[PDB]
Ligand binder design. Structure first.
Ligand code: MG
Ligand code: MG
Ligand code: MG
Ligand code: MG
Ligand code: MG
Ligand code: MG
Ligand code: MG
Ligand code: MG
Ligand code: MG
Ligand code: MG
Ligand code: MG
Ligand code: MG
Ligand code: MG
Ligand code: MG
Ligand code: MG
Ligand code: MG
Ligand code: MG
Ligand code: MG
Ligand code: MG
Ligand code: MG
Ligand code: MG
Ligand code: MG
Ligand code: MG
Ligand code: MG
Ligand code: MG
Ligand code: MG
Ligand code: MG
Ligand code: MG
Ligand code: MG
Ligand code: MG
Ligand code: MG
Ligand code: MG
Lengths: 205, 120, 111
RNA sequence: CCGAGCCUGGUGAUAGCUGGUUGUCCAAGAUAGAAUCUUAGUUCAACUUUAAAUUUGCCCACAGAACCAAAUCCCCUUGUAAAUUUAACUGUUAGUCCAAAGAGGAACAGCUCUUUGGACACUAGGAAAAAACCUUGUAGAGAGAGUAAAAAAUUUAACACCCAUAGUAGGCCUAAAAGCAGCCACCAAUUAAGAAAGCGUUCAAGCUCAACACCAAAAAUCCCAAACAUAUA
RNA sequence: GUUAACCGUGCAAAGGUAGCAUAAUCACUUGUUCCUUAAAUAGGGACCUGUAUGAAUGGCUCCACGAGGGUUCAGCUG
RNA sequence: ACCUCGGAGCAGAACCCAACCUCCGAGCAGUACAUGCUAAGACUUCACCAGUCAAAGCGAACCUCAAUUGAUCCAAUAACUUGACCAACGGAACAAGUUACCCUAGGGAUAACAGCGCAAUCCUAUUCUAGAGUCCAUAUCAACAAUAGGGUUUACGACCUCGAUGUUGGAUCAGGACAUCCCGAUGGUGCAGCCGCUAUUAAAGGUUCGUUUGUUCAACGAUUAAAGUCCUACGUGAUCUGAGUUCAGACCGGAGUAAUCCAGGUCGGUUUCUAUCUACUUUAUUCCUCCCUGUACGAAAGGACAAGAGAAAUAAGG
RNA sequence: GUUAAUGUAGCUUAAAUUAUCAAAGCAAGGCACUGAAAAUGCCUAGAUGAGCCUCACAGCUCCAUUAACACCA
RNA sequence: GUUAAUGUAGCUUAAAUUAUCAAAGCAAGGCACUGAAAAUGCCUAGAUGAGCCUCACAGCUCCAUUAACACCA
């Protein structure tokens, strides 16, 4: 059906063992689905972050409002929020054990498409309302097409060839040049210098 | 964690372009080194504090010679950031027994065998 | 409120005790384990707690031999009998290459 | 001065608790943990000091270490010079922050908790002053010298102009929906103007567009060095 | 359960009776209402769910009385 | 709530590694009767203590399971051996409450007052155009969210102080901030005008008196041009008050067998200091009447601007 | 909020499983009829969701409730 | 733990063997029915396992219980 289905709060199988909040689930590029499938238009996440259910009800009710379902469709690329988040009730001293299970979230890494769209319309049509839903998200977003996304990678693959600065990040970081692996994380070899925690730096080679 | 690093072996491989910049050539490599420490061992970990007593680089900016064999050369790979490695080149031959009274290093690394203080 | 309780057990210090190439005398414990990790090969015995103990003075070596268990082991013959027909299982095995010979002959008297 | 008088005596009571601990001169010297009516303490270990004895210790390389990322272990060569054992020991066994991997918490704390690594309690320089960031350690004098770290950069939204007739108040649907409440269709007139893209219409009327044609900042005593775009790095 | 006299029911040694009352009386509370005030979280009299009142742990009134604790008309005075 | 021993994660690849961190278990059961005797070599729960294995030998056949547990001294016993939920699990042979009548030693290693850290809670403004607003997102309101800020609350943290940093309200005098309540200056308005709503700007000046409560608050009466939000150690106790709170007294109500106890109530309850030092100690407003005038305005009811005169009240100065 | 306990035929007490008896309700029988009293038969996820087994039965997930503390500051 | 004693028809007291009678339960009979009261018949490894004989009967193996001590240190 050419509309985004109702994604629920609190998936109907409740997990009893609550998970530690590993923030390595946000770091760096997404190894998961980072290229289109049966859809030309999407909102690529240019930064990591957490998508609540309250984030989903914003995009599900704004895309469906501003789309003719006759000429367009829209598919998610993110699952239901599976990771539980623990909140202690405010007004307790620290400790006593890990608190109650409160609300569920899903981790979106950088470079991961969120909701893919397509149909008998162009990128300049969907740019009106996808840029609405872009800025409302808890990370740097940018609505890109297929022809708009792979422009950005030839930019980022010419800029690894074009720069005349003889010191790049990756030549210094993989070699431990000044003793620089002391300050750099062991992920800094692996991502590139282009990332910094949750935040992705696009202006950087 | 921050642990002891290990460097993958495609940085200790020179291109043919690097022999245009530096003077060395891949045929006939240099027999001896000139190593001199240019950083303090302080704020560096204890392995990079104990190789420096192993090569004898305790007094900084004081040059030292070591073989260019790949057993010593692995030790220089750990403490490379502390040190300044230059090749030892000899304009003359080796100093024999009537020569070692008046020798000196001559920065640009020329172990000249006859050091007079007289002009040219 | 501490809903959980119990998980305070110390470690087991269980690993390999004599590593490869080491001169290992008779009766010496080569490795300590549970839920089998290193299997006994030549001149290595196994006690009650699955300890690997050396049976002759020598040098320990580690190979990857072929795993055919006892037909009186009914928990792996029903594992074997559902492999495809080109499969081998390949557990890893420790060894002891014996160094000292088990004795020389000496002249004692001319009687 | 009474929750049990006062004085003398046992009494130099006891105190895992505070306070004090007095010549000069040099030398080595930073704390994995385990128990414990124990976490304000102590015994053991770890660590450290001297003195002995004897031989290797470090750094390490091809080989090697499980099924269900950084790296570490073992380790000849190597560069080096300390290591182990023995004897007698005391002391530390209430730590901090930075980076990193994580954990708890709010993906808060100059927060708490562990591993790895520094620094800190040790001198000196820089970061305005500064414990922990950066440069540096083995010491004295000198009215000598070269250096190390080392001085924040930035200034951002102008916009088209001209021209709009008709099949037709498209059918359906609706009291009434005329390009624009809702449906399916979306041909075609003259050069070219959509069975109409925003308003505006109860419905209309118009007003335009598409086309001809033309060429980032807000808080409490009072901002806060001064200032300077142009003689060669 | 029909606000219930009433019913059936459990359990106890008995199941708080007379009164009295938002108390010097947990909380709701500055309960509600009349009176006093221009206006009253104070006071006075009544209403009672007091779920933590209550009868020599004494109850409830009342005559004098108090350097007792609260309110008050009249005066009066820096 | 827990205290001992076990497995998995945190701790991905020797070992180790915390936690009132996340989950699972255990205080056994069964097969044996050589579950006999001895004895090289080792590992080892970071010490010790216990723990683990085991070649060979002797004598004979021809253990499983993860954890499944407890020291010494003492008792029972001829002997071999057997004795604790000594679970506060390295265990004192046997000992609970209460203290605001308290005392001493200390501690900012360790709390309540304030500072500071932070900003979840809260508060302000943006960004987005849904939904309101008869039609109309942006006159005015505002959901889902996002981006930034402030440090008033309630919390959290425990870094300063326990060889004292005095507390709530009140007095008094106020210093300040602007996120402006009035007074001015304008843009907009679903602004006819009178009235108001919103944003820019402005911190010179002004910001009332009363009944009940300890009250800050709130409610209530009468006002006014308006009865501003806040910070300053919840401004200011070597300036004052102590009514609250919070010692020793006592009740009532509840809990406790009792001593005692309670953010539950109520009656009563010592506020010390003679200033060494720093600082310091003479520099115009707002409203009302009258006017225009009952005009501008509207259809009416209603009703001003700016121009002008006249009155007062306050502050400052005499 | 922390703990503690309870969950029932329509009502309730029960019963160490397998579930009683007494009200209610259902007619029947005595009555001039209604009541009582008999005489009958009924009425039970034992508040749960998986089931380790085999469970009101025992450890939960649990939902509604009932008592306790929520202090010295 | 050491001793001591008890084991019962569905309940209990009995009985020196061979086992009573009184409750319960079973119908019957009197009743308008139910109860009582009769009138009937039942209900017993006498807690055991071998049996020396022939045993609740007597010495055990015994299983469940009930009292006693478990001290002076
Ligand atoms: Mg563990
Ligand atoms: Mg541990
Ligand atoms: Mg003393
Ligand atoms: Mg020294
Ligand atoms: Mg102590
Ligand atoms: Mg800290
Ligand atoms: Mg701390
Ligand atoms: Mg027109
Ligand atoms: Mg009351
Ligand atoms: Mg009064
Ligand atoms: Mg008197
Ligand atoms: Mg050990
Ligand atoms: Mg044998
Ligand atoms: Mg203890
Ligand atoms: Mg203990
Ligand atoms: Mg008292
Ligand atoms: Mg008293
Ligand atoms: Mg004291
Ligand atoms: Mg301190
Ligand atoms: Mg505080
Ligand atoms: Mg609307
Ligand atoms: Mg502190
Ligand atoms: Mg104090
Ligand atoms: Mg003082
Ligand atoms: Mg002081
Ligand atoms: Mg302003
Ligand atoms: Mg007054
Ligand atoms: Mg104050
Ligand atoms: Mg005073
Ligand atoms: Mg003062
Ligand atoms: Mg008095
Ligand atoms: Mg002074």
């Amino acid at each position: 059906k050419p509309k985004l289905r109702f994604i629920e709060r609190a998936p109907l199988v409740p997990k009893v063992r609550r998970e530690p909040k590993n923030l390595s689930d946000i770091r760096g590029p997404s190894t998961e689905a980072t290229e289109f499938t049966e859809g030309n238009f999407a909102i690529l996440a240019l930064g990591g972050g957490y998508l609540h259910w309250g984030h989903f009800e914003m995009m599900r009710l704004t895309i469906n409002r501003s789309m003719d379902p006759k000429n367009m469709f829209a598919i998610w690329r993110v699952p239901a929020p599976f990771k539980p988040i623990t909140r202690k009730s405010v007004g307790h001293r620290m400790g006593g054990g890990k608190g109650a299970i409160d609300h569920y979230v899903t981790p979106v890494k950088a470079g991961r498409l969120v909701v893919e769209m397509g149909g008998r319309c162009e990128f300049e049509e969907v740019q009106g309302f996808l840029d609405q839903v872009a800025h409302k998200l808890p990370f740097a977003a940018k609505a890109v097409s297929r022809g708009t996304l792979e422009k950005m990678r030839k930019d980022q693959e010419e800029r690894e060839r074009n720069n005349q600065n003889p010191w790049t990040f990756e030549r210094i970081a993989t070699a431990n040049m000044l003793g620089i692996r002391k300050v750099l994380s062991p992920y800094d070899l692996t991502h590139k210098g282009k990332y910094w925690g949750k935040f992705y730096m696009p202006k950087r080679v | 964690k921050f642990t002891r690093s290990r460097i993958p072996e495609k940085v200790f491989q020179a291109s043919p372009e690097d022999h245009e910049k530096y003077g060395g050539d891949p045929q006939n490599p240099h027999k001896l080194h000139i190593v001199t420490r240019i950083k303090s061992t302080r704020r560096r970990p204890y392995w990079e504090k104990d190789i420096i007593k192993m090569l004898g680089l305790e007094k900084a900016h004081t040059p030292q010679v070591h073989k260019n064999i790949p057993s010593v050369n692995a030790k220089l790979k750990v403490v490379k950031h502390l040190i300044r490695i230059k090749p030892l080149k000899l304009p003359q031959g080796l100093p024999a027994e009537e020569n070692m009274s008046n020798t000196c290093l001559k920065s640009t690394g020329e172990l000249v065998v006859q050091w007079h203080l007289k002009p040219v | 409120s501490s809903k959980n309780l119990g998980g305070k057990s110390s470690g087991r210090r269980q690993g390999i005790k004599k590593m490869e190439g080491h001169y290992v005398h008779a009766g010496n414990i080569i490795a300590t384990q549970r839920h089998f990790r290193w299997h006994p090969g030549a001149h290595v015995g196994v006690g009650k707690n699955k300890c690997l103990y050396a049976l002759e003075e020598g040098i320990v070596r580690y190979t990857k031999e072929v795993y055919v268990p006892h037909p009186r082991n009914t928990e792996a013959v029903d594992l074997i009998t559902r492999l495809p027909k080109g499969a081998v299982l390949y557990k890893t095995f420790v060894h002891v290459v014996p160094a000292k010979p088990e004795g020389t002959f000496k002249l004692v008297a001319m009687l």
